């Protein structure tokens, strides 16, 4: 969704993948917070008790059980964390029946969109180009450096498969709320998938550096109902 | 002539010009070089 | 440490080198070479006689290093059992650094070999690119390199048993038998019909083969120096650290060639 002024946490999710990412992040932060509190408490104790101390214990230097325990505990923490990450990795993907295919070519400083289906006998594939609206031409209330003249439109509750490639340099297709971040290499085809659960507007930006106009190539997706999708498609 | 002022590449005491001048010019030049490059490449592309 | 007059000699077996001007001069030569090469390829110079002068200055600096490194060991006599061991360890650690650069090129060859791009037809050496037959001159070079590796061991055994004529002949034959390798591989770049810029095969074939050429010119220079320093009575029968340093290099070069002949010529 849109970024908010004093942000502290993730943007509101609209895909199951982003929900999984949020859950996994909050599952790891548990153990990280526990470790940090432990180390901080020990340092506080050292400052409080042993500052300019008269007695120095210069013969507690080996240990044998405590070194077993600060070698085994982090291992069990790592295994506990690693289980859910592997499940999320192997499970979530386009398991069955992709239902729509969109090709998003990234040219130098704008995007090109092709809808692989919807072809007539003569090759009338619906296609367009998305630019960035300059500041001098913005209308009343349009976001700066995020608003495009032509926006991607998709139905809600349908699998969308984005096939990403590039024509000049290495770009990056990103939309934070939908949980999509894939590269656009100059000689290969990458693919990502998404399912949108509610209607709205979702904004994103490129990631990999490409030169002068890296800060202006926004991505914009609308999730309209099926009827509005049919009306929109019967006009383009 | 081993001593506490003998291993440094520069002279610090019994010096005509006081050491503060060489010490300050070092940091002034070091912290002013990166602005020269920006000025040069700004005056070359029209913008001021 | 109770020998009678012991304070008249050094108490530790290590070499305190005298002040030398070669590091700074080599640094300046490399600086000039880098700036001139970076400029000439994009205009700004025009004439090409400055790059060659820079290269010559770098080489002269290295040679003048080696003059002192030979004088400090054969005339002044500062090379004990400790300093010799240190020199050997350092040379091994340098040779390892050269070896791990060929690994990068081999990995570059195997990354494009397995997974060829769609732009080229899915086939190694592609259409319009005739490879070099491995039943030709590529097979003479293997034989000559193995014979060279076998002929330098007779030179190291002819110095242990105190033979003079019998170490010069072997070293001369080895030099004259590595020059033949270089000549054969310099008349093989003129009988090929695929260049540096025709494909990814021709950009990596030459990168690996090209580095081998320079490392063999270094061997020719080293063997010539070993002959010249033996003819003038510099090598004793138990203190000779040029021959060993030049023999460990030749064997590594031969082992590398036997990988450049199994992965570049037969496989395709």
């Amino acid at each position: 969704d849109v970024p908010t002024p004093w942000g502290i946490f993730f943007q509101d999710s609209a895909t199951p993948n982003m929900e999984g990412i949020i859950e996994l992040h909050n599952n790891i932060m548990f153990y990280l917070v526990l470790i940090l509190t432990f180390v901080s408490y020990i340092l506080y104790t050292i400052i409080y008790n042993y500052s300019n101390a008269t007695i120095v214990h210069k013969y507690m230097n080996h240990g044998q059980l405590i070194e077993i325990v600060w070698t085994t505990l982090p291992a069990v923490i790592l295994l506990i964390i690693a289980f859910p990450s592997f499940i999320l990795l192997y499970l979530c993907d386009e398991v069955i029946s992709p239902a729509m295919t969109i090709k998003a070519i990234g040219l130098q400083w704008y995007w090109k969109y092709e809808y692989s289906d919807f072809i007539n006998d003569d090759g009338e594939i619906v296609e367009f180009e998305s630019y960035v609206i300059p500041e001098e031409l913005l209308e009343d209330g349009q976001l700066r450096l995020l608003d495009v003249d032509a926006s991607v439109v998709v139905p809600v509750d349908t699998h969308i498969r984005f096939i990403v490639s590039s024509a000049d340099v290495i770009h990056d297709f990103c939309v934070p709320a939908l949980g999509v971040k894939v590269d656009a290499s100059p000689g290969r085809l990458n693919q990502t998938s998404a399912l949108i659960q509610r209607e709205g507007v979702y904004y994103g930006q490129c990631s990999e550096l490409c030169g002068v106009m890296h800060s202006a190539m926004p991505i914009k997706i609308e999730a309209v109902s099926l009827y509005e999708f049919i009306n929109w498609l019967d006009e383009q | 002539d081993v001593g506490p002022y003998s291993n440094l590449p520069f002279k610090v005491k019994n010096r005509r010009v006081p050491y503060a001048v060489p010490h300050f010019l070092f940091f002034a030049i070091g912290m002013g070089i990166p602005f020269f490059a920006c000025y040069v490449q700004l005056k070359r592309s029209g913008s001021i | 440490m109770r020998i009678q007059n012991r304070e008249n000699l050094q108490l530790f077996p290590f070499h305190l080198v005298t002040n030398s001007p070669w590091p700074l001069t080599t640094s300046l030569a490399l600086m000039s070479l880098a700036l001139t090469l970076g400029l000439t390829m994009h205009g700004y110079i025009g004439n090409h006689l400055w790059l060659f002068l820079a290269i010559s200055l770098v080489l002269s600096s290295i040679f003048l290093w080696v003059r002192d490194v030979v004088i400090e060991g054969t005339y002044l006599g500062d090379h004990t059992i400790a300093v010799r061991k240190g020199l050997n360890i350092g040379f091994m650690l340098f040779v390892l650094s050269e070896i791990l650069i060929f690994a990068a090129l081999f990995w570059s060859y195997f990354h494009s070999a397995m997974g060829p791009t769609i732009e080229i037809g899915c086939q190694w050496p592609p259409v319009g690119i005739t490879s070099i037959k491995p039943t030709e001159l590529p097979l003479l070079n293997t034989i000559i390199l193995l014979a060279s590796g076998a002929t330098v061991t007779w030179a190291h055994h002819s110095i242990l048993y105190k033979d003079r004529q019998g170490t010069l002949v072997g070293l001369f034959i080895t030099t004259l038998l590595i020059i033949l390798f270089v000549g054969c591989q310099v008349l093989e770049y003129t009988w090929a019909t695929f260049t540096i810029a025709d494909s990814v095969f021709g950009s990596i074939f030459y990168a690996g083969t090209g580095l081998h050429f320079i490392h063999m010119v270094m061997l020719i220079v080293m063997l010539a120096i070993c002959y010249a320093r033996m003819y003038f009575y510099h090598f004793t029968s138990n203190h000779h650290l040029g021959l060993e340093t030049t023999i460990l290099y030749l064997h590594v070069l031969d082992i590398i060639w036997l990988f450049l002949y199994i992965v570049f010529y037969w496989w395709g």
Binding site: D1, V2, T4, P5, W6, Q11, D12, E135, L138, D140, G141, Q142, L143, R144, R198, E199, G200, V201, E222 | - | -
Partner: protein
């Protein structure tokens, strides 16, 4: 008595040749059986060896923490002033206005955005 009485306030100013004299006079006086030593001698013997002088002074005195605190405050005020001066003279684009960040709210409310925690583009 005058030599040893009240070493806690005079002892550090004496030179290094009048110190060894007192140390040498407290060495031929301690060999005798104790309880024959005056109280000032006992106090001086304790002070000369284990006392808060020389290499047992503290790393920080009470007047040094104040110096450090008021130095840090002075170093922060300078940065605040310089950033304020660089902050007043800004290029403020046309989007950074309260009457503009209200229309974006209407657009973002027509298309339900951030149904969870919240949407608001107002920061004046």
């Amino acid at each position: 008595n005058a030599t040893v009485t009240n070493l806690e306030k005079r002892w550090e100013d004496l030179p290094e040749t009048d110190q060894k004299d007192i140390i040498s006079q407290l060495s031929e006086r301690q060999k005798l059986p104790w309880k024959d030593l005056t109280l000032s001698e006992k106090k001086a013997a304790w002070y000369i060896s284990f006392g808060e002088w020389g290499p047992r002074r503290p790393v920080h005195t009470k007047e040094d923490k104040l110096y450090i605190f008021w130095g840090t405050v002075i170093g922060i005020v300078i940065s605040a002033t310089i950033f304020g001066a660089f902050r007043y003279n800004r290029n403020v684009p046309k989007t950074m206005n309260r009457e503009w960040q209200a229309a974006s709210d209407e657009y973002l409310k027509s298309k339900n955005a951030e149904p969870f925690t919240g949407y608001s583009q107002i920061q004046s």
